[PDB]
Design a binder for this molecule. Structure first.
Ligand SMILES: *Cc1c(COP(=O)(O)O)cnc(C)c1O
Ligand SMILES: *Cc1c(COP(=O)(O)O)cnc(C)c1O
Ligand SMILES: [Zn+2]
Ligand SMILES: [Zn+2]
Lengths: 408, 150, 410, 148
């Protein structure tokens, strides 16, 4: 891959920060930056073909509808789904909520109730935790969780086969430890109780090849804005056969088959799960982001990010009193790199890095139970994207040494 | 140097040598506050005089960054011994300075070492670090005053 | 109004359509077009200040968080709400769903149950109907409704409220008949049972001055993409005191204050109601749309749209066998104009208009109970925006006349 | 003119529609609605004594010129035909109207069916054209299930 060419696609990467250094953006794990192909795909659509989708029958409606459904097809190809298995939401969080609500719905045969068990993990982002707490609260189902190994991996030895388990929710790829999870083993175990699997793929889809059929998960969620796409668009994957059995979550226009004052019947999937005007221009932008990543190639993206991640782990590990949260090994590991600086609070570490133009996240990264499990209040997190460079990793390492000097 | 302008000597000093640390008896109110910038927390007590007119003690524990811990230390030096309304006025001057995005330098006559947090204001994310102990005190003072009579 | 200058802000209005004629876009009721000020406010944000909101502490995070919370404040000022009384959703539909789910939650003290009555209207868009049917289904509450007058207004004589009524949901402004509803009367009636009011304001916020404190409704929903703003952003208004009493709907990151594996406690409103990364650049865009409309002046917008509506009613009324669904007067009426052509199916009327470059919606406009009440399977719908012209209304009328000639009706 | 979409065959069947009105006997009955809001059909298929030939297609409902003309033309092409030949004609029609301007259709296979070639260019109206055809496909599959 031509890294200089790739970086030339992202206007924001030229920015000079308040400390006088060019941006080193190491927070793509929170939200990614946009290349011109994504900005221009969206603006070209809005200035030429902006009309209602699937509503009426004029020329702009036909063009907007074509762009909406071709975008769904492009994104499905990118993640190894069929077109009809993707549902658009405002974010990944909403996708996991949709599944968490349908699993409590009397009209769904696979809904959970008292005596049933929901399993999540102590590694999870809050988006793949709080909806399971709420589903347990509403239905009287029991919540359980896999624990975390000392190296920040899902602890497969921490739960055992239980016929009561009906839902197993787990990350594909940790947003803190960077661990790549044993999906095949977790699915095989889920199937031993006839449990449904819910894959949090927010940090896999931007960072590695993903084939959702191959993975054999029942559901998966991912986030447009983390994969170079627009804000305001998430995706739920659901196996065709499962979406067909599922009652709607949000209701309103566009998702009905019939309506009277007394009641309604509902459209087939995926229209069943898209209530009201969709994020039409954002689908166009997200499809452009999928084509962009596809043109680099997701194996090449993962190889580049793994080079940066290893350099970060090795450079930070070379600083006395700096500890990684997650493995130092690159086995089954990718972005990001979360770390503690002995004797320097994460807020002070992030401030020093920021003074040098290096943007990292400080805090719990939306995974507080994970931090608590390691007795940590907060970490600094450098996350990596296809546009980041070895020189930005060197500036990360230099900033962390500077923070030790400045406070030490 | 931009870093020195936010991290002034007073801040590094109170951070390294904090004052009135460690929860004490007696006390009229106890609060627990957490910085939305996940990593800073304070448990803070206020004791009032027999007649309820003066702050006689501010005791605290917890964990956080240089800015959150230094600010709580400076708070205790500014409000210990002061009339409840004078403590309240000092908190309002502090909040106005650090919330000012750098337009208010603060009055060293009202804030004392409080003024050392002026350079925090142009870093709006770090303003919540500085406000943690001060908003904790405002909460505890209003609970300790209400508690008093009766 | 400088109509020529306003139209110059909208690149799409120059488009030559497949029949050879410049676009005459009369479907802003479905989705509005974007001015450069909106497109540019969002692009400038994305290429300069794009960072996580309320998450970490770096410079881009501070700029993004500033843009998000200033956008909330700008939009609140536009609709007469306090900043903290707005919740961002993907669309107005989700905003109505959010209210419909919280009103069924055991943790809300105003939650509905067996014996309680939910009231909607036969005038409603499906977004302000289906969620109430589902709330009734989940809770055991029952659904009642106002009917519709022969002129397409809420029939206040068709329903008597009683003490069982806990929710009254209704349109501010019909997306089919164009009727402006009697909000202060419905609020007064709802209050006789201590019922909550839910206002569907999707067709008021873009087309007339709206002051949500004044209107005295408990909740309101509106749509960004109908008021010149981006896709992917709707708005829920809730009275500050009501939002403070409500449990969350969607859960996840950013809406929590504490978290263990066992449980969580939730942030205050409006953050309580915003789970996951918000639509940051779309808040920037919608704020720019509110500032754009504010600068024209919503009284001037309404006056302009009312002139187009009156000319449309006059011109269509003059065609033999054309009838309006909704008032033929301008009393308590705005956009849009929905109509039937005797002997010509709406699909055909719309195809003839489109051949002339005139875009109208054909179908039920997401208000099938309303169509069924008038014995209609579909209407053609001309909706108006600040960028539309009297010359475009003449093209609408000519195209409807042409559709009668083309299909051999006269 | 740029209609073209509205060919004489289409206007002709709309004004003079063939086989309209539900008839008996029938072996299955179906109710179909346009995703584009405004067209519906109730359609019956009768089969021969031996189940091998379509003996009747009867229907009712309301819709636009394109939905009603398409359904009239369907009945003309399919009545008296072998089930497999009926199925082949439906596939031919669907391929033509679904192709955007790309497939002209074969008049030997579609007869007046080819008049709907112009509709392919207007994807919203393709759903109008398909209503009666997909309704017949449903009712035929059901009538053949009924048979045994
Ligand atoms: C457009 C509209 C809706 C739905 O808004 P979305 O943005 O589609 O979710 C609801 N009510 C009325 C009156 C409308 O016009
Ligand atoms: C970002 C993230 C989410 C939440 O996605 P949103 O787009 O914020 O809703 C969930 N899980 C993981 C692992 C993430 O990184
Ligand atoms: Zn701090
Ligand atoms: Zn039709």
């Amino acid at each position: 891959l031509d890294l200089a060419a790739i970086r030339a696609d992202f206007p924001i990467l030229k920015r000079i920060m308040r400390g006088g250094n060019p941006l080193a953006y190491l927070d793509s794990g929170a939200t990614s930056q946009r290349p011109l192909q994504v900005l221009d795909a969206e603006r070209e659509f809005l200035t030429a073909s902006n009309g209602a989708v699937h509503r009426g029958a004029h020329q702009l409606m036909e063009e907007a509808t074509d762009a909406y459904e071709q975008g769904r097809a492009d994104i499905a190809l990118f993640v190894g789904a069929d077109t009809d298995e993707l549902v658009f939401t405002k974010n990944a969080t909403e996708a996991l909520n949709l599944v968490s609500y349908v699993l409590g719905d009397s009209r769904f045969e696979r809904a959970v109730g008292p005596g049933d068990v929901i399993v999540t993990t102590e590694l999870e982002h809050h988006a793949n935790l709080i909806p399971w707490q709420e589903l347990a609260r509403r239905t009287g189902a029991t919540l359980r969780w896999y624990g975390v190994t000392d190296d920040g991996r899902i602890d497969l030895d921490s739960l055992y086969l239980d016929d009561r388990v009906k839902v197993v929710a787990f990350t594909h790829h940790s947003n803190v430890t960077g661990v790549l999870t044993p999906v095949s083993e977790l699915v095989s175990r889920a199937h031993q109780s006839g449990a449904l699997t819910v894959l949090d793929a927010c940090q896999s889809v931007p960072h590695q090849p993903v084939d959702l059929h191959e993975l054999g998960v029942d559901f998966a969620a991912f986030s447009g804005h983390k994969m170079l796409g627009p804000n305001g668009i998430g995706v739920l994957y659901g196996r065709r056969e499962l979406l067909a059995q599922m009652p709607p979550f949000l209701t309103g226009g566009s998702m009905i088959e019939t309506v009277t004052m007394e009641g309604a019947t509902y459209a087939p999937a995926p229209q069943r799960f898209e209530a009201g005007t969709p994020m039409t221009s954002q689908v166009v932008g997200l499809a452009a982001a999928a084509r962009y990543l596809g043109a680099i190639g997701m194996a090449a993206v993962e190889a580049h990010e793994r080079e940066l991640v290893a350099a970060a782990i090795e450079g930070l590990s070379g600083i006395d009193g700096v500890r990684i949260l997650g493995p130092t090994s690159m086995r089954d590991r990718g972005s990001p790199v979360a770390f503690v600086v002995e004797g320097v609070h994460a807020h002070d570490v992030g401030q020093v890095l920021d003074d040098g133009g290096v943007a990292v996240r400080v805090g719990h990264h939306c995974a507080l139970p994970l931090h608590r499990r390691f007795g940590l209040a907060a970490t600094a997190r450098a996350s990596f994207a296809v546009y980041n460079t070895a020189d930005e990793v060197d500036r990360l390492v230099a900033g962390v040494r500077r923070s030790r000097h400045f406070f030490g | 140097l931009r870093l020195e302008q936010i991290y002034q000597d007073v801040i590094l000093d109170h951070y390294k040598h904090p004052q009135h640390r460690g929860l004490r008896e007696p006390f009229g109110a106890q609060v627990y506050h957490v910085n939305p910038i996940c990593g800073d927390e304070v448990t803070l007590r206020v004791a009032l005089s027999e007649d309820g007119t003066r702050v006689t003690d501010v005791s605290y524990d917890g964990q956080g960054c240089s800015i959150s811990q230094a600010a709580t230390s400076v708070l205790t030096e500014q409000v210990i011994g002061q009339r409840v309304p004078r403590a309240l006025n000092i908190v309002d001057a502090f909040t106005e300075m650090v919330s000012s995005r750098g337009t208010v330098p603060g009055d060293e006559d009202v804030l004392g070492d409080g003024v050392a947090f002026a350079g925090v204001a142009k870093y709006p994310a770090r303003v919540k670090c500085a406000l943690l102990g001060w908003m904790a005190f405002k909460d505890a003072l209003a609970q300790a005053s209400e508690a008093f009579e009766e």
